[PDB]
């Protein structure tokens, strides 16, 4: 407990996890090429409502 | 295989020199220095390789071409008379006193502080 309005309480008692070592991301011309490919030539004709890029329902 | 083609050739009786624009073709190598240009212009124009004064060589983007200026003088006296001093210093017949502007200005002010014969004495 301590006090109600403690300055920096939630960020102070937040759990601390580390970053995961991952492969680097392409940037520049190849990023737009990958975006164009994934958005326009890997698509299938579907119906209803189009799924979002981050949809995880 | 370094060839030289001339351009805009025009002679002056009033300057006793011939101005022209030099186009140098050196494909596959670096920029050629000016002294082989001087001997090659001496060979093609049948002149001694000491009155030819060249400068301003810029290499085009890509490599292979170089455009610059060059003059051919009649004799050494005309080459010594109407020329800038830095080209003569580049060819090695003129040299200047090794003093900066700050020393000259301070010596001039210190000489201005006094009057008379001692003006030369204070200037050392």
């Amino acid at each position: 407990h301590g006090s109600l309005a403690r300055v920096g309480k939630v960020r102070g008692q937040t759990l601390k996890v580390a970053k995961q070592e991952k492969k680097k991301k392409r940037t520049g011309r190849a990023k737009r090429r990958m975006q164009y490919n994934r958005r326009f030539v890997n698509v299938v004709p579907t119906f209803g409502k189009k799924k979002g890029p981050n949809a995880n329902s | 295989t370094v060839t030289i083609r001339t351009r805009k050739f025009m002679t002056n009786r009033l300057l006793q020199r011939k101005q022209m624009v030099i186009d140098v073709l050196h494909p596959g190598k670096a920029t050629v220095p000016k002294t082989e240009i001087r001997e090659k212009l001496a060979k093609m124009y049948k002149t001694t390789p000491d009155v030819i004064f060249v400068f301003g060589f810029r290499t085009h983007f890509g490599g292979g071409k170089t455009t610059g200026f060059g003059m051919i003088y009649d004799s050494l006296d005309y080459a010594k008379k109407n020329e800038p001093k830095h080209r003569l210093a580049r060819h090695g017949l003129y040299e200047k006193k090794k003093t900066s502007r700050k020393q000259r200005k301070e010596r001039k002010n210190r000489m201005k502080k006094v009057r008379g014969t001692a003006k030369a004495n204070v200037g050392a």
Partner: protein, 185 residues
């Protein structure tokens, strides 16, 4: 009082709507099909097309048989037919407005190398141009946004100082050859 120029201008205009859908769709389609790097290039081509269209509109609001109209309109028409976006059968003042962004982006050096038949893809074409491999009339070009003319299209080939058009090999060929000489010797 210094001897400078102080003359410069922007070559692009940002759109009014920052987050739209269809506009971003055709911009992404143009970037992916022409192998561009960012939206600044397609906005620049759109800006210069808009300037040409604005000049054509303000000359088309004018009346006929005006000598300055005939003069700088013929100047604009000869520029547009010498750049490669217009034809001789459409040498008219209204046919400038029927132009597209495809016509201006098709005279880019990248797609000209890609459609000429010496590059595998358009990104490979940009890599090939950027690494000093081609030349246009005895002069190499280091950049992909070199908008060619109609009279200079048939002169594009590989540069002399390149391993593709006949010349000294690169560094990995020589390094692997030296490694092979060391292993065999």
């Amino acid at each position: 009082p210094v001897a400078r120029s102080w003359v410069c201008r922007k070559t692009y205009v940002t759109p009014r709507r920052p987050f739209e859908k269809s506009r971003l769709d055709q911009e992404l389609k143009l970037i992916g099909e022409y192998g561009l790097r960012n939206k600044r290039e397609v906005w620049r081509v759109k800006f210069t097309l808009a300037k040409i269209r604005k000049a054509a509109r303000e000359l088309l609001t004018l009346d006929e048989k005006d000598p300055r109209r005939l003069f700088e309109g013929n100047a604009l028409l000869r520029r547009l037919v010498r750049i490669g976006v217009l034809d001789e059968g459409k040498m008219k003042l209204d046919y400038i407005l029927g132009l597209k962004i495809e016509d201006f982006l098709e005279r880019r050096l990248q797609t000209q190398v890609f459609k000429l038949g010496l590059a595998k893809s358009i990104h490979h074409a940009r890599v090939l141009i950027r690494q000093r491999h081609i030349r246009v009339r005895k002069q190499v070009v280091n950049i992909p946004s070199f908008i060619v003319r109609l009279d200079s299209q048939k002169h594009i080939d590989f540069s002399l100082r390149s391993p593709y058009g006949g010349g000294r090999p690169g560094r990995v060929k020589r390094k692997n050859a030296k490694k092979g000489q060391g292993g065999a010797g």
